[PDB]
Design a protein around this ligand. Structure first.
Ligand SMILES: CCCCCCCCCCC(CCCCCCCCCC)(CO[C@H]1O[C@@H](CO)[C@H](O[C@@H]2O[C@@H](CO)[C@H](O)[C@@H](O)[C@@H]2O)[C@@H](O)[C@@H]1O)CO[C@H]1O[C@@H](CO)[C@H](O[C@@H]2O[C@@H](CO)[C@H](O)[C@@H](O)[C@@H]2O)[C@@H](O)[C@H]1O
Lengths: 257, 433, 618, 48, 75, 180, 367
């Protein structure tokens, strides 16, 4: 059933076995007194071995077991039984078998784990396989270099809470200033800008551009003049605008407005 | 905020934060801009504001502390109110292209469609009425592509103005596009609101802010409530969210096609140029470790033909167990004639007896008969030798490869409810978190 | 003492629809209808007072393995409670959900419904509350509506009732989607203002005297509003309507196991024929012909990933070594590639209505003009044609002295790709691209030297011409106005490297890009019949021009026998760039009418560098 | 949990059986819920 | 700053410090797979596990070729 | 200085004082940083003739940051003592003879982040850290293939501010490594 | 599907830790004498050929998702005389390590929690007759699968168990065509007090008391080819909770559950047989079985097939197993793979169990 009785399956690699105690103690008063300390047993293994060889000049064994990565395409195991060419059975493969099909319509699977057998009746080659597939098919389309990604947003799926006009002046100027783009009909050039947000992190650090923390009184009607085609109540929240504005109607936004 | 936590448009006057403020976070700004020779300021800066603290006294017993606030302008409020002008400061015309990073022109197409129920590149009037007569050349709606309707196409490839546009999205990297973040900004602040309302307006008696006066054409196309209300509050108006921004963008980065996987199996990559399968040793090369496919065919590199690359990547986590079984006959009629009878069956084992929509299991079978016939034709070699300056002795070859495949699909018997293949639109278990 | 065994804020995936569902009241934020949506599950509500929650007959708890254990997952249903003042005669209350469901591969849509009276309230009677589903693009203009009158679960005694009396079969919705298709085809002929539509605008085949047999379902009531599509259900709503004339009904209705069943498992066929021949390393002809039927696909593809369209394509690629037709003594490398191909894709479902099969719609039209319009707007045709003369050059002789004027330094590359498509969107899409490139590259081999070490110069004439006309999906008589994009461009870059001294090194380069703009009229109106080969060898007005200069110097001060230790190294990179402003700037027209030239842009750059070692030894 | 696991001084078994001080197990509040072996089996009620 | 999950026993989101290349995080969380599958980018790494349940969850962060897995704690 | 700007208020107008009655400055900044770093302050590395190698290094760091938005001095201090001992016991008998490699790594990191107010005595301790650690490991080759390592890690982290809790971690035990 | 399965604590004791048994369909009670034969049947340690042996076994969990979760085992056996042997095993199921933190600095102190579960057992096996041996094992089980937070205690729950096993191996009996060998074995496992995860008197969980009875036969060809066919039946000795009820509505359920949970383990062993409205034919469903065939060539290559089946209404864990074993000089390497056949997802699917056993000392003959 085998060519000879010699079994020279050579193993290689390393194995580690760590056994010890892990003691932890956190002084959190909110915990129960039963959680004063945690003394557990820490056991770990790092089997990092391979195993290659031939058995009876008919079995080829090739295994790689390494418990330090994703096993789906690292932990390999291959048994190949190849009888004499005179026999009907030409190859029996167990483990990481392959099913390469030279057909465009029907594609085989390259990464399988199971049994693959091959029979040869004179001129007929019957290759059977039964296995579990460890891979997934994925298709990409590339035009002129790299891949092409399609996207389908809808009208409502805009980018919210991220983009803010700096004033009602800029908001009401936007459409008219972009009437003849790429020419922007606006001489405004914003030179300086500082933005303050709610501080929930409360993390003081010299490397994050300094440590600036100020009390802030953010007003809504600050720097607000009227607008030509927009009523005042759409520009300011103040109940009465009588005696509020002290600049012409279309004045640019400024503290003095 | 640091300068790397936001960007801003110095000309159009709006900030774009790096982090979304979807909660009670308050946004306040102080900015200084120039209009020619005039300088305007709207908040108090740290440089020119009051001192943070003023202390009056000698020791801690009599010292008086006065901590003072900077006066800034509110952009986002603590409590959300949509009937306030501070709500209008948020820009609702910016659309983030999903996972786009560095969108570049000639590798970016955008289009606006009206899905009702099919993607259509224009807008038809409500039956019984018609679009406003004699519109301006920039207010055409009838028989007009939607890029022209929403003012996203008025320039040619080189950004020079054109009469009806070129039918392509106007890619201006400072007005309509944000290159470093992959965002598309519309040229109007309310494109699907006041813009299309003005396009469809038939008289001065209709006001955008009074939806009771719309003329039955604005009652269908004007999506006012996505700008006057939150997105969740705009989900109530279901019949308006019909405009679809559909497009593509090409990501290359480096030299070669990134197949989206690493350490792919040898021989698992199939590349098809224009319905024909390329040869892995001739027309392209594969770097498996880096997952790159480089097209080596000179005529195919400069061809604009969409190349489809299919690969079986084993770097998957969470996929159901797939049972692959089947056989393959390889009858050899002669020394140059092969007939194959491949039969394959792929089943999947769902994690649960219930299959939700999208996580569907397959029980497919595919069987095919193929035939290969490769011969040498010395007639072609002699004909080539009959050519003026050709006297080569390399033999000519012919090869005919036919194949027929049948796919009988099914669903696994495990995911069957009362004997029929079942997919759960909603089992009502995923609600109420 | 109050002990909270559990205290949570519970949020649901189903939002209450705050808006009218009948066109008569128009103010649903009234009527005093306390409308609640919650969930009843077997883990918590298995002891409810009116009816203990039990799984529907045949439903089982999902079992999972977390850690060597079998955990029966929760089984849950959506409860809707209508109390307070109760529903009006025709008013309805519903909860909605945004989804993306393609239910064209499945024949049946099924659901379990349960109705019960509220405790301490007047008893709800049979066939008073109607459980309805409404799915489609929206809930007001385009939807399918499936209603079913509910049989109330009898209560009063024990709270534990058998599941077949809780989840009755008379209340289970089992709707064949082909009934929906028949209703859609029937309603295609119903006017939007027809009297067959109700006040809400929904068309119920049951209430149509001219229609025989109703909607084909004796237990369900079907309705359709605005040409919806169950090939992509974007909005799904479940709710309760009322049928009691002089009554306001209060009750609790459970919905459970909303599913699609009876998959269409008809297969598909495909065929491929590749004829590949090579002729004495001179010719190579590869003809591929593929033909696939509807429903074909790969093993890994599910119901909605398989091909819903008949594909029929071919592709013939030819390679010729024309340079071998000439004697090899003066070697010419002239490859000629000619690749033609085309594909035709006939969809399974009509592109309009998106969910009616093309054959069924064609049969049920009875209008030859409209049948032709449908059959023609369905087909997706594409034809590509590519010609290539890339890498045209004269091969160097085995014993040949390199020379600056030798023609062997030049290299030529021609490309021409044409694409003609037309599908449901584009009535006729044409895209022609021509790309001609001439490259030159010479490398010299062995007061100061003035002989450049290497000279490079490559030109390019890139022309793109897209014509894109969209179709009127109504009639194939007029169509839209064609849109023309043209990218006629002439690029050319050059450069040279001097080694004036053993220390100096001067690398210069200049790249320019001009745009050909002869295809426009006096105004900015593109011409229609302007060929891409019309005026080819045309250098347009400049559009961009970049220069770069690189100087490297070692400052030979070591020759001075006082400073033999200095290792000074100077570098100077200069860059310049002129960019043409768009015509919106160069021809700006102010509102007063004056035309202003706002000019182009120029950019400059220096990169001075001075690395000195200044070794203090010696 | 120190009251039920390792009973402190001055506490009797009668102090832990009052329906206001007693321990709640998930098998009482959720008798139909299955809990994995070795995980939390008790309901940590919030007492007021 | 190699790879951090700052609040591991969290009643809130996950802050997910990592490199520039974007993320494809997912959650399965005690038994089988219950993919969350958010699309964390370089400078907006905020998750959402506040509502699901309480338990020891499995995450598989994917920075392209940087597939780093681990366990988080919903308090 | 991470970012200095020219002040638009520093002009020819007669308005020369701000709200704080200070003269306008030509150049205005928000933060300045003085970063000092002894890396290392010292590194005594010596190998004895008995193979006892010692690597004792002290590092120090200051990160003064003056902010002119609030005129506060954020001071970040860091100190780090590190000791590394290496010994090779020769021919230790368990009948089996081989060398025992002893490797000890002691460490002590102190870190502080104060915020100082100039106008009065309000030195705030914004942050801190105080972590000492000790990793002992003794390797012994029982054979040409099988080796045994005895490891012992002990770390203690004190609380500088109350938001952090003291933490003691003690890993210990054996590790058998077999090679083929 | 599954209806009212038995609720027993520390279920990880029932998971096959070694690759040989996991390749033989999770049964080793009657197989040949093995180093891993502590979890299945210690009584055959007296029949071991080699003087002493060590074994390291690894069973990964959820390999696709996480590489930390696993079940490891370290076994050591040593036979002093030809009549006795001492064995000791340590099974450790671990989640790896969760490095919990609450700040963003990459150097702040992180707290490691490793919810684990380990059984350390030691057995003495004495060979009474020349073909029969007995064994007694004492096991300590500790569970620390909880993470300490506020208002929750993560104290480890411990318990003790006593295993009584017996193994009979007949001499080489010749037949008409081959000289086979008969084996039989029984093993009662995890007889001990209830393990209390809450550390409270009222809420306690039974230990997974187990009963394995198996028999096997070896066909011997040419004295260097072996084919061993083994068949094992297994049964749980823990009373099954009642179903609908044996009397409002919740009253009966609560009463029946309380009656079931107020049963001691000593009485529970006897109460296991029955306690159901069904008859003896329905009662016999509680027994799981497993049949395996192992082919040995040159005593250094082994190919094993196994099939393990439980009842449809409880457990529902049915699968096939492949296994391969190779001996180079003194190290035997075993690899096992599992093909599931049950409607429930087995966490050992797509998982290659590994085992590595060293054998050293004098060679003892086998009768
Ligand atoms: C409770 C646990 C006990 C654990 C016992 C460990 C014993 C380690 C000794 C290494 C060892 C066993 C192989 C172990 C492999 C497991 C590795 C683990 C990896 C984990 C992932 C290698 O032995 C093999 O390896 C070869 C190395 O190439 C040896 O070659 C040579 O090997 C060396 C000449 O001996 C040369 O120095 C080396 O130069 C050569 O090359 C060969 O001798 C032999 O093939 C030899 O064992 C020997 O040590 C003694 C001790 O006194 C043991 O006595 C026992 O002690 C108590 C029990 O300890 C018991 O109470 C007691 O009754 C009993 O008398 C015996 O066993 C004995 O035979």
């Amino acid at each position: 059933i085998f060519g000879s009785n010699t079994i020279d399956v050579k193993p290689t690699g390393s194995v580690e076995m760590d056994l010890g105690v892990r003691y932890t103690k956190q002084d959190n008063p909110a915990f129960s007194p039963r959680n004063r300390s945690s003394l557990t047993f820490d056991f770990d293994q790092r089997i990092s071995m391979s195993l290659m060889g031939k058995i009876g000049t008919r079995l080829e064994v090739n295994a790689n077991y390494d418990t330090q990565s994703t096993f789906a395409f690292q932990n390999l195991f291959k048994l190949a039984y190849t009888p004499s060419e005179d026999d009907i059975i030409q190859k029996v493969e167990v483990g990481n078998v392959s099913m390469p099909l030279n057909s465009t319509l029907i594609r085989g699977a390259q990464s399988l784990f199971g049994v693959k057998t091959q029979l040869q009746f004179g001129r007929t080659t019957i290759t059977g396989v039964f296995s579990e597939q460890k891979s997934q098919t994925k298709s990409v389309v590339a035009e002129n270099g790299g891949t092409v990604q399609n996207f389908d947003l809808y009208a409502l799926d805009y980018d919210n809470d991220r983009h803010f006009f700096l004033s009602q002046y800029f908001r009401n100027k936007y459409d008219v200033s972009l009437k003849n783009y790429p020419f922007i009909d606006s001489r405004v050039q914003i030179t300086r800008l500082e933005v303050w947000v709610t501080n929930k992190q409360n993390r003081v650090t010299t490397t994050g551009g300094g440590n600036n923390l100020r009390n802030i009184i953010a007003l809504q009607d600050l720097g607000e003049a009227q607008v030509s085609g927009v009523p005042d109540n759409e520009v300011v929240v103040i109940s009465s605008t009588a005696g509020f504005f002290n600049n012409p109607i279309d004045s640019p936004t400024s503290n003095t407005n | 905020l640091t300068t790397n936590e936001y960007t801003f448009n110095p000309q159009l006057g709006y900030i774009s934060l790096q982090q979304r403020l979807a909660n009670d976070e308050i946004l306040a700004v102080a900015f200084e801009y120039t209009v020619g020779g005039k300088v305007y300021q709207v908040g108090e800066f740290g440089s020119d504001g009051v001192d943070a603290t003023v202390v009056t006294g000698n020791n801690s017993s009599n010292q008086a502390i006065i901590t003072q606030s900077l006066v800034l302008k509110m952009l986002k409020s603590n409590l959300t109110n949509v009937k306030n002008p501070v709500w209008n400061l948020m820009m609702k015309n910016v659309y983030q292209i999903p996972q786009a990073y560095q969108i570049k022109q000639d590798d970016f197409r955008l289009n606006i469609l009206y899905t009702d129920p099919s993607p259509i590149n224009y807008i038809t009037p409500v039956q019984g009425s018609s679009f406003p007569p004699n519109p301006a050349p920039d207010s055409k709606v009838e028989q007009t592509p939607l890029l022209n309707v929403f003012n996203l196409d008025r320039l040619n490839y080189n950004n020079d103005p054109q009469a009806g546009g070129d039918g392509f999205f106007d890619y201006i990297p400072g007005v309509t596009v944000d290159v470093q973040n992959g965002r598309v900004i519309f040229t109007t602040k309310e494109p699907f609101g006041e813009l299309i309302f003005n396009k469809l307006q038939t008289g001065a008696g209709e006001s955008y802010n009074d939806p009771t006066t719309y003329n039955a054409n604005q009652q269908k196309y004007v999506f006012r409530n996505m700008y006057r209300n939150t997105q969740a509050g705009a989900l109530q108006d279901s019949d308006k969210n019909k405009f679809l921004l559909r497009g593509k963008y090409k990501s290359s980065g480096s030299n070669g096609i990134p197949i989206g996987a690493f350490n792919v199996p040898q021989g698992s990559v199939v590349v098809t140029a224009a319905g024909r399968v390329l040869v892995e040793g001739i027309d392209y090369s594969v770097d498996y470790q880096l997952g790159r496919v480089q097209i080596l065919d000179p005529s195919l590199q400069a061809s604009n033909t969409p190349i489809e690359v299919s690969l079986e990547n084993n770097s998957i986590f969470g996929q159901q167990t797939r049972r692959f079984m089947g056989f393959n006959i390889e009858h050899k009629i002669s020394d140059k004639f092969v007939i194959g009878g491949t039969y394959l069956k792929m089943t999947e084992r769902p994690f649960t007896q219930k299959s939700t929509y999208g996580q569907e299991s397959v029980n497919n079978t595919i069987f095919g008969f193929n035939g290969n016939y490769s011969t040498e034709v010395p007639f072609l070699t002699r004909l080539a030798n009959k050519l003026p300056n050709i006297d080569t002795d390399v033999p000519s070859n012919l090869s005919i490869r036919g194949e027929v495949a049948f796919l009988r699909p099914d669903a696994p018997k495990a995911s069957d409810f009362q004997g029929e293949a079942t997919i759960y639109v909603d089992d009502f278990e995923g609600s109420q978190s | 003492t109050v002990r909270f065994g559990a205290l949570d804020l519970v949020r649901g995936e189903w939002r209450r629809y705050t808006g009218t569902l009948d066109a008569n009241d128009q103010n649903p934020d009234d009527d005093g209808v306390e409308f609640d949506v919650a969930a009843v599950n077997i883990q918590e509500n298995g002891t409810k007072c009116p009816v203990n929650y039990v799984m529907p007959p045949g439903v089982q708890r999902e079992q999972l393995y977390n850690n060597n254990t079998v955990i029966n997952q929760n089984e849950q249903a959506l409860a809707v409670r209508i109390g307070g003042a109760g529903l009006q005669y025709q008013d309805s209350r519903a909860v909605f959900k945004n989804v993306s469901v393609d239910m064209r591969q499945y024949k049946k849509l099924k659901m379990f419904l349960h109705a019960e009276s509220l405790p301490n309230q007047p008893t709800l009677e049979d066939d008073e509350m109607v459980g309805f589903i409404r799915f489609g693009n929206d809930f007001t203009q385009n939807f399918y509506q499936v209603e079913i009158p509910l049989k109330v679960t009898k209560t009063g005694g024990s709270c534990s009732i058998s599941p077949d009396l809780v989840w009755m079969d008379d209340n289970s919705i089992d709707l064949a989607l082909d009934l929906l298709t028949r209703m859609k085809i029937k309603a295609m002929s119903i006017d939007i203002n027809s009297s067959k539509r109700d006040v809400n605008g929904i068309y119920y085949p049951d209430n149509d005297p001219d229609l025989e047999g109703g909607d084909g379902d004796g237990k369900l009531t079907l309705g359709i509003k605005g040409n919806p599509n169950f090939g992509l259900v974007r909005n799904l709503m479940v709710g309760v309507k009322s049928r009691a004339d002089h009554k306001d009904i209060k009750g609790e209705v459970w919905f459970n196991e909303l599913r699609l069943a009876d998959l269409e498992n008809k297969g598909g066929m495909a065929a491929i024929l590749n004829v590949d021949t090579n002729m004495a390393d001179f010719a190579t002809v590869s003809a591929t012909g593929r033909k696939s039927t509807i429903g074909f696909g790969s093993l890994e593809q599910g119901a909605n990933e398989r091909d819903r369209e008949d594909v029929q394509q071919y592709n013939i690629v030819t390679n010729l070594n024309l340079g071998k037709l000439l004697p090899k003594k003066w070697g010419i490398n002239l490859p000629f590639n000619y690749a033609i191909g085309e594909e035709v894709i006939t969809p399974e479902y009509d592109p309009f209505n998106q969910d009616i099969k093309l054959d069924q719609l064609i049969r049920e039209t009875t209008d030859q003009a409209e049948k032709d319009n449908i059959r023609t707007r369905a087909i997706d045709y594409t034809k590509r044609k590519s010609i290539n003369f890339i890498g045209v050059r004269k091969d160097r002789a085995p014993e040949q002295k390199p020379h600056v004027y030798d023609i062997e330094n030049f290299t030529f590359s021609q490309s021409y790709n044409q694409v003609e498509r037309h599908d449901y969107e584009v009535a006729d899409y044409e895209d022609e691209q021509s790309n001609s490139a001439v490259n030159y590259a010479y490398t010299f081999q062995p007061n100061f030297n003035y002989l450049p070490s290497n000279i490079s110069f490559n030109t390019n004439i890139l022309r793109q011409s897209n014509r894109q006309q969209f179709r009127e999906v109504e009639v194939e008589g007029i169509g839209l106005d064609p849109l023309y994009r043209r990218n006629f461009a002439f690029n050319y870059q050059y450069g040279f490297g001097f080694n004036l001294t053993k220390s100096l090194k001067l690398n210069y380069s200049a790249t320019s890009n001009n745009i050909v703009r002869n295809f426009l009229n006096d105004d900015n109106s593109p011409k229609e019949d302007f060929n891409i080969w019309d005026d080819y060898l045309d250098i347009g007005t400049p559009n961009q021009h970049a220069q770069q200069l690189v100087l490297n110097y070692d400052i030979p001060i070591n020759k001075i026998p006082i400073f033999g230790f200095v290792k000074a190294s100077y570098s100077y990179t200069a860059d310049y760039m002129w960019q043409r402003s768009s015509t919106a700037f160069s021809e700006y027209e102010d509102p007063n009418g004056t035309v202003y030239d706002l000019g182009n842009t120029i950019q400059n750059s220096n990169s001075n560098t001075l690395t000195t070692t200044l070794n203090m030894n010696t | 949990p120190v009251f039920y696991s390792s009973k402190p001084s001055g506490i009797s078994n009668d102090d832990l059986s009052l329906n206001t001080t007693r321990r709640i197990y998930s098998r009482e509040l959720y008798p139909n819920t299955d809990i994995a072996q070795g995980q939390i089996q008790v309901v940590n009620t919030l007492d007021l | 700053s190699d790879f951090l999950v700052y609040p591991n026993p969290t009643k809130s989101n996950i802050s997910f410090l990592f490199d520039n290349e974007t993320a494809s995080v997912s959650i399965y969380s005690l038994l089988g797979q219950k993919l969350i599958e958010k699309q964390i980018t370089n400078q907006n790494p905020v998750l959402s596990v506040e509502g699901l349940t309480n338990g020891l969850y499995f995450y598989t962060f994917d920075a392209g070729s940087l597939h780093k897995t681990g366990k988080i704690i919903k308090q | 200085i991470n970012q200095f700007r020219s002040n638009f208020d520093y002009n020819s107008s007669p308005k020369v004082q701000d709200v704080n009655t200070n003269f306008y400055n030509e150049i205005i900044m928000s933060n300045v940083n003085l970063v000092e770093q002894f890396s290392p302050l010292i590194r005594m590395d010596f190998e004895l003739k008995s193979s006892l190698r010692v690597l004792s290094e002290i590092k120090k760091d200051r990160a003064l940051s003056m902010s002119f938005d609030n005129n506060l001095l954020t001071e970040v201090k860091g100190m780090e003592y590190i000791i590394g001992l290496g010994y090779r016991f020769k021919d230790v008998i368990f009948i089996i003879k081989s060398d025992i490699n002893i490797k000890a790594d002691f460490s002590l990191r102190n870190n502080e982040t104060l915020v100082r107010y100039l106008d009065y005595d309000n030195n705030q301790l914004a942050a801190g850290q105080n972590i000492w650690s000790l990793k002992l490991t003794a390797d012994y080759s029982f054979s040409k293939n099988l080796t045994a390592i005895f490891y012992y890690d002990h770390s203690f982290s004190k609380a500088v501010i109350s938001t952090s809790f003291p933490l003691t971690n003690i890993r210990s035990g054996f590790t058998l490594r077999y090679n083929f | 599907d599954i209806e009212r399965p038995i609720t027993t604590g520390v279920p990880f004791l029932l998971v096959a830790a070694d690759a040989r048994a996991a390749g033989l369909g999770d049964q080793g009670v009657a197989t040949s004498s093995d180093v891993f034969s502590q979890q299945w049947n210690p009584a055959k340690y007296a029949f071991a050929e080699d003087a002493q042996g060590l074994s390291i076994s690894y069973t990964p969990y959820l390999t696709d998702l996480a590489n930390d979760i696993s079940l490891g085992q370290v076994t050591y056996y040593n036979k002093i005389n030809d009549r006795s042997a001492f064995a000791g095993s340590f099974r450790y199921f671990g989640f790896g390590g969760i490095e919990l933190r609450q700040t963003g600095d990459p150097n702040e102190p992180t707290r490691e929690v490793n919810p684990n579960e380990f059984a350390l057992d030691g057995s003495y096996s004495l060979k009474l007759s020349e073909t029969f041996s007995m064994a007694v094992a004492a096991r300590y089980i500790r569970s620390n699968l909880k993470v300490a937070t506020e208002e929750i205690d993560a104290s480890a729950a411990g318990s003790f168990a006593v295993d009584v096993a017996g193994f009979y191996q007949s001499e080489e009996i010749a037949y008409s065509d081959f000289n086979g060998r008969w084996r039989a074995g029984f093993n009662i496992q995890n007889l001990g007090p209830k393990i209390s995860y809450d550390h409270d008197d009222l809420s306690a969980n039974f230990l997974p008391a187990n009963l394995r009875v198996g028999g096997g036969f070896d066909f011997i060809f040419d004295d260097y080819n072996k084919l061993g066919v083994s068949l094992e039946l297994t049964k749980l000795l823990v009373p099954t909770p009642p179903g609908p009820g044996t009397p409002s509505q919740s009253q009966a359920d609560e009463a029946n559950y309380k009656k079931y949970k107020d049963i001691g383990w000593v009485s529970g062993i006897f109460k296991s047989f029955g306690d159901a409205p069904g008859g003896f034919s329905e009662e016999l469903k509680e027994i799981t079985y497993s049949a395996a065939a192992e082919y040995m060539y040159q005593d250094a290559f082994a190919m094993r097939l196994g099939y393990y089946h439980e009842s449809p209404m409880k457990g529902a864990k049915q699968f096939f197993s492949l296994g391969a074993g190779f001996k180079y000089s003194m190290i035997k390497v075993d690899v096992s793979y599992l093909f599931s056949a049950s409607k429930v997802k087995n966490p050992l699917e797509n998982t290659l169990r590994f085992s590595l056993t060293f054998n050293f000392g004098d060679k003892y003959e086998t009768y």
